[PDB]
Amino acid sequence: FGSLKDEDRIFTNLYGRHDWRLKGALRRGDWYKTKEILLKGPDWILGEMKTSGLRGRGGAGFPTGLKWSFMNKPSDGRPKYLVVNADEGEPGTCKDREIMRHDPHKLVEGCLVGGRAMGARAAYIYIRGEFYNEASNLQVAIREAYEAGLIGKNACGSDYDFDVFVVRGAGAYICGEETALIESIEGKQGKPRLKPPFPADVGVFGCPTTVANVETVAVSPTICRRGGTWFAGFGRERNSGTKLFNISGHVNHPCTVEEEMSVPLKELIEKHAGGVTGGWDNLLAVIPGGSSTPLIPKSVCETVLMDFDALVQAQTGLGTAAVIVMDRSTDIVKAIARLIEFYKHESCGQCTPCREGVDWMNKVMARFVKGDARPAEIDSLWEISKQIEGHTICALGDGAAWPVQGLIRHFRPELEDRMQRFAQQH
Amino acid sequence: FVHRDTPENNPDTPFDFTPENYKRIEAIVKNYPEGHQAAAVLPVLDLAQRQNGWLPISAMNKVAEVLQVPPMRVYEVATFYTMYNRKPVGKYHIQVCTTTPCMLRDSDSILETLQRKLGIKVGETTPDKLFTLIEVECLGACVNAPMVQINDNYYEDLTPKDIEEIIDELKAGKVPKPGPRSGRFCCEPAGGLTSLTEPPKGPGFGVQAG
């Protein structure tokens, strides 16, 4: 439904307004039951995650509990590890920039709460290098915490020993990928690996590893504190909890606000954030989960709401839940065209289908904006799109195909007219 | 992506970490597991850039030696990521975000403003080498859509004029109040908090027993 209470919200420091430093955090009481929780043991913590129903919170929303659980298997003499990706690259995502900058601590105890759940020896946080200032904030926060003894040996009074590190990203969206974050951490080129050697099995430095969206790590301590039920109650069925929503582009007050997941879309922009610029009638389309997810046109939108189950019914992905809105004042053919330009300037090129395919769609898309290309080419790009969708080594090729598929699926008449417009003036 | 040796950009340019920098390099190596120094390539290479913006081929070679990694590896990392200059770069090095979110909120205007403000075209640098204009991609901070990254700072939610003001500040004086130069605080609802209006909660609240 929606309308989460501020009291039941998780990052009270969102929008700042409270010292992102420890003191403000102590008034927040973020480090309240940390020793106790870890004392409970890895299993109990992971269990709470399952009860929570917390899905990914990052890109694909895999059940968090089960995922983390995959490394709750006995150590084989290799130190297990925690990797917390804070790349936050998906266009439209400033979701994570908040927790890191505004509430660094929540993530610090998220790390150790999560750490004992997987029995990780240590956690490395890969904040995108672009955010240099952001990094300045977290290690100040990390430094505070150890000074306190909250982390490190004798973590918060626990025999558990966990060390948290921050790693510099270098302006790559793909670094974000789970197998590629690792390789950047490993120091090689940021190129994803194949899934058959799964991340838990082969870890960073060949030591079991797990990767979580920073939001996913951050909520785990509060969910254990509030209990899985409290959390699981807010969401709809499988889709559960309240996910932060970042609305950017063609909305009166673009902002990131956390609301009950499964909140109706027509409502999200209506209640928080602000009204669609030019009236709700001025809504050509919206991309619910960021650039990777397909945009949904206005008639479908209010009907549907923001939860992953509802969106997959709608053929779109909740993803990072970044709402980008396009008024009737925008050349979508060019809007999506720059996202394909966003992906040609960024895919690693390791795999044949993404390398040439994304460049091929970029060339066709640029011609489509001009209208130089003939109408028959439009379904040609359909077929190029699915060749890339199922054949890619990672998901980015998955992601490049979806916006192209959305433009053809709902805005096929407009592209034909741009086709027609150029043919007429000759 | 080919380094054709040039008198300026080639190893004749000797590179070596200042004593202090080497100390920093050591810590960086400590974070990673022992026996995995190679993992510190990115961090160390960055430090080199901090030392010299150009990050010449010589620098890349030094990084390799310092981390005992094959020279090619350093090259791969440098030529793969984008935050590494691999050429001389402007003192200010402004970068304008032009992904759809920003563009939808009129990013193009900002770029145009800069082009003539700077007098230099994108992909190029000012004669004094004070400013280098680059059309970079999503830099995060999308909510404050109109946004650009001057050097390390993130100037956000900027209207065309604001930048001119900022650029002037950069041109005469320094530290031009880096950050979103609009009333909105960070990424709050511009008009008024849609939530988080009430005071934050307290320790232990609604906590399940133990």
């Binding site: 240099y132 990094a135 490190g152 040996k153 966990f162 | 810590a27 960086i28 597991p33």
Partner: peptide
């Protein structure tokens, strides 16, 4: 306001806290 070495130098300061290596 932060310096170019804030991240690295701060980290070095944290080195002492950093738990022993693997």
């Amino acid at each position: 306001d932060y310096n170019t070495y804030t991240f690295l130098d701060l980290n070095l300061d944290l080195s002492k806290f950093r738990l022993p290596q693997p």
